[PDB]
Amino acid sequence: QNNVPNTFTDPDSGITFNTWGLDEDSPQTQGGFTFGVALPSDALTTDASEFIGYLKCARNDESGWCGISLGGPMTNSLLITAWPHEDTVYTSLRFATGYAMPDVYEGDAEITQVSSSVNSTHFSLIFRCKNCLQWSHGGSSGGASTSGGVLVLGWVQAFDDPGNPTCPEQITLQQHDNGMGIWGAQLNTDAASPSYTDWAAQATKTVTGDSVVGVPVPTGVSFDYIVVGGGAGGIPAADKLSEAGKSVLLIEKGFASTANTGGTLGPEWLEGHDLTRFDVPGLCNQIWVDSKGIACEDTDQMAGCVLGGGTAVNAGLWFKPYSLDWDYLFPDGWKYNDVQPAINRALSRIPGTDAPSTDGKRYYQEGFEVLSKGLAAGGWTSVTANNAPDKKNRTFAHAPFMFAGGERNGPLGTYFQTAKKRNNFDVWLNTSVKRVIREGGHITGVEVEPFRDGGYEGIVPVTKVTGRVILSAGTFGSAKILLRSGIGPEDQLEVVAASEKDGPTMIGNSSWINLPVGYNLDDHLNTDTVISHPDVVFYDFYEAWDDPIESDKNSYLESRTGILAQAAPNIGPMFWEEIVGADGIVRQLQWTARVEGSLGAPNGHTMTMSQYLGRGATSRGRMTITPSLTTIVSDVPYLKDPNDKEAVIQGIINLQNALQNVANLTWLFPNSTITPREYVESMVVSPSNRRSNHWMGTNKLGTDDGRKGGSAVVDLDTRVYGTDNLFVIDASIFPGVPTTNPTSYIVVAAEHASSRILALPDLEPVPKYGQCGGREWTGSFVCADGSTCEYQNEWYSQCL
Ligand SMILES: Cc1cc2nc3c(=O)[nH]c(=O)nc-3n(C[C@H](O)[C@H](O)[C@H](O)COP(=O)(O)OP(=O)(O)OC[C@H]3O[C@@H](n4cnc5c(N)ncnc54)[C@H](O)[C@@H]3O)c2cc1C
Ligand code: HEM
Ligand SMILES: *[C@@H]1O[C@H](CO)[C@@H](O)[C@H](O)[C@H]1NC(C)=O
Ligand SMILES: *[C@@H]1O[C@H](CO)[C@@H](O)[C@H](O)[C@H]1NC(C)=O
Ligand SMILES: *[C@@H]1O[C@H](CO)[C@@H](O)[C@H](O)[C@H]1NC(C)=O
Ligand SMILES: *[C@@H]1O[C@H](CO)[C@@H](O)[C@H](O)[C@H]1NC(C)=O
Ligand SMILES: *[C@H]1O[C@H](CO)[C@@H](O)[C@H](O)[C@@H]1O
Ligand SMILES: *[C@H]1O[C@H](CO)[C@@H](O)[C@H](O)[C@@H]1O
Ligand SMILES: *[C@H]1O[C@H](CO)[C@@H](O)[C@H](O)[C@@H]1O
Ligand SMILES: *[C@H]1O[C@H](CO)[C@@H](O)[C@H](O)[C@@H]1O
Ligand SMILES: *[C@H]1O[C@H](CO)[C@@H](O)[C@H](O)[C@@H]1O
């Protein structure tokens, strides 16, 4: 939709609105969308509580529905839902913690109606929302301030119609397949009217209507290592541990993904050759249109919960690490010279490929040829991505992948395969870990509950004394486990205490460790741009799911070759440049070109280039947790430091200087009339639109003790401060986001950290009368036999 509002007068009720919305034939939503607001008189100065609004929604083949997010993200915001049934339009206010079925809003809000109009192609509405702007649901409290002059809103539309469209509260829905978006909505002189109460009392309508399998833990079972989660860092770590001969258990909350992991689920034409939906690179883009049973429901962001984690559902981009990243982002011992052997071990398993097709050819390069030769004339040098990892400035290349055999490979096809064939390695799927149970600073076992049927219920102990637990659960995952284990900031630990789920069963206050868990939240800032060229050829990977092209289908199913052997959409040239700020700090930009429509530009002749803001970004956010025990982003990391925004703008400036030599090339986003500065600042800054989906830094690696008021969570051994046997290997430990897409960096970190943990001497229990604990205490937290750990004060604990 349109940013600058539009004054619109509805004749019958005589009510005035400020209307934003899209149109019928715009390549965003089918049937168009329009929304508006009627506020109180004082709204533009002091915040309004209730309001009045106008909904014009699409109806496709006499079927559909639409929704409004008042906060504008789907998660943790008050949602308005409307669908036609016969003449009557129905409304149910909902609330959604993660990406999933929103539950009925339990707050004080109420909907009343003025007018109802339903025809074949459309159903409109004029209603009144009371106590809607300020909302509270189950401990979560949101709000919308009309005082600022702008209102961030969000919208959806759909084709199918809900489960029975009679009772608003009990309806069932599926993912909205027509359109979605977030836009800042500005208000003006016509938003606030003195007649508001005559219009408010004019709404006379109140619309009416009419467990999991618990399989227990085996008897005498214990493990030298328990690795939680099968993600990017988990599978490589558990593999190297099992290689050493240690008895290792890998606990994954999801199910089998790729066909070599025992996978089943996949499209219709993949039946019989052992290919799943995850294995085919051309079908990788379907995770956006289908999240069912895959995406994590406990996070407000998007993360794959299946086996392999993000590596299963991602594009598969795999890069050889820039040496400057490890030097800049990490302390001594994690630097480049230190992680050099880790890089060699990781790339020997998964060497990069810039030609994913098994015949060593690239397909539909028409889009690539336009930008490549254009950037070459722009003064940018062409390189092979993994043959020159250390040239990131003014340069481009083909997209390297973790693929091989023409299929999605990753840690699933290398690290996991060698792991599954050993004796000492074991995997528990459909099983989520609630917490780690611990006495003082020593973890005994982990507490599991089934996420699905065939899951495990109980407590599985580590080998006595020596046993170690590794948290691979991920950026949001590992932080949630630590918080329910009594480890983290005070405010968040008290949230877990007041929760219904973990409330009565939580550990004692005296055992709480205070670490900045959830802080140092970072990510690549994403800024999309769109160009249009006559020579660019679009390929549809979405219709390839149900009905693949005859040629290309047989090409992949036989020789594992063709356009379906490539990621979706077709990923064009990747170029980087390093920008020096006024603060002296070098910030890294990475552009990713692909052939698709993005911002509402048509698909065929257009290419989208996404700009990631990498290493050098000083801005940080924070991850918190709800009493529902769901992970949300309380503070958005992007664009805090003003010097970060300057780097983004300059990147667009220099890119336009390089690509302006190209004939017939057209810039859709931004248009020719908008300067790159005006285009960046007029954009909305939110986790939804601006995320690159790469999340790192919730548990920070550093030498500065977090208990002493430092920023670190885990030390240089990736071990949690205040604990001898607990370790964390995943993207969460990265102090900042690297130059490039993080997956390859995380697997390397897994290789490096696993080597350190193995090298560590076995834990030796503290003898009687010794000091087993303290808030400054480094050493062994476990007491010798015949002795227990007694808490005196925060600074001291003794073996007795
Ligand atoms: C769609 C998508 C596109 C992306 N594109 C790329 C790309 O092309 N290339 C690239 O470099 N990066 C890409 N990434 C980013 C990358 O996938 C992640 O940053 C990376 O996987 C992080 O790894 P992790 O181990 O820290 O977390 P994850 O990979 O998510 O691993 C966490 C695992 O733990 C499991 N789990 C979580 N909680 C629990 C629990 N409590 N108990 C038991 N198990 C649990 C989950 O099932 C999951 O399998 C993309 C990400 C997404 C989602
Ligand atoms: C059960 C039905 C629903 C499912 C399965 C669902 C799932 C999702 C998923 C997976 C995304 C992100 C997709 C992506 O990142 O590409 C999303 C985004 C969105 N959803 Fe929900 N949703 C549902 C119902 C709704 C409802 C009822 C509303 C509000 C009335 C809503 C508003 C939004 C908006 C505005 C976005 C885009 C902004 C954002 O990503 O947060 N959705 N939905
Ligand atoms: C996990 O659940 C899936 C479906 O929910 C099932 O197909 C699979 O067999 C289960 N795995 C185990 C180990 O129970
Ligand atoms: C126990 O709770 C209090 C506040 O209720 C908090 O100040 C204290 O730090 C907690 N104990 C520990 C060991 O953190
Ligand atoms: C990258 O190259 C450009 C062009 O030569 C130069 O202006 C810029 O300073 C370089 N960046 C760094 C970090 O050296
Ligand atoms: C300039 O941008 C506006 C709004 O984004 C758009 O309506 C207009 O079409 C653009 N200009 C051109 C020439 O397309
Ligand atoms: C709304 O209605 C009032 C009367 O209550 C008018 O005075 C105003 O101009 C607007 O039409
Ligand atoms: C509704 O109520 C307000 C409250 O004063 C009036 O100003 C308005 O004219 C209408 O009667
Ligand atoms: C409730 O009453 C109003 C008049 O105040 C009507 O306009 C409306 O259609 C509903 O019957
Ligand atoms: C419809 O029903 C609600 C019930 O709360 C009333 O408040 C409203 O005035 C209308 O009668
Ligand atoms: C626990 O008990 C089982 C039988 O239920 C044994 O097989 C196992 O070795 C352990 O003693």
Author numbering: 1 to 210, 218 to 807
Pull verbatim passages from the article behind this deposition.
An oxidative system was recently discovered in which extracellular flavocytochromes, that is, cellobiose dehydrogenases (CDHs), cooperate with copper-dependent lytic polysaccharide monooxygenases (LPMOs)8910111213 to catalyse redox-mediated glycosidic bond cleavage in crystalline cellulose, hemicelluloses and starch. CDHs are large flavocytochromes containing a haem b-binding cytochrome domain (CYT) connected by a long, flexible linker to a flavin adenine dinucleotide (FAD)-binding dehydrogenase domain (DH). The DH domain oxidizes cellobiose at the C1 position to cellobiono-1,5-lactone with reduction of FAD. The ensuing step involves inter-domain electron transfer (IET) from the reduced FAD to CYT haem b, presumably by single electron-transfer (ET) events, followed by ET from CYT to external electron acceptors such as LPMOs.
The crystal structure of MtCDH was determined at 3.2 Å and revealed a closed state in which the CYT domain is docked onto the DH domain in an arrangement that would allow efficient IET from FAD to haem b. In the closed IET-competent state, the haem b propionate-A stretches into the active-site pocket in DH, where the propionate carboxyl group forms an anion–quadrupole interaction with the electropositive edge of the Trp295 benzene ring. Propionate-A engages in an ionic interaction with Arg698, which stabilizes the propionate in its ionized state. The haem b propionate-D is folded away, and a hydrogen bond to Tyr99 in CYT prevents it from interacting directly with the DH active site. The closest edge-to-edge distance between haem b and FAD is 9 Å. This distance is well within the 14-Å limit for efficient electron transfer and is nearly identical to the haem-FMN distance of 9.7 Å in flavocytochrome b2, for which rapid IET has been observed. The MtCDH structure indicates that the haem b propionate-A in CYT interacts with four side chains in DH at the CYT-DH interface, that is, Trp295, Ser298, Met309 and Arg698, a region that we refer to as the propionate-docking site on DH. A channel leads from the surface into the active site of the closed MtCDH molecule. The size of this channel is sufficient (∼11 × 12 Å) to permit substrate entry and product exit while MtCDH remains in the closed IET-competent state. The crystal structure of the closed state of MtCDH offers a favourable association mode between the CYT and DH domains to permit efficient IET.
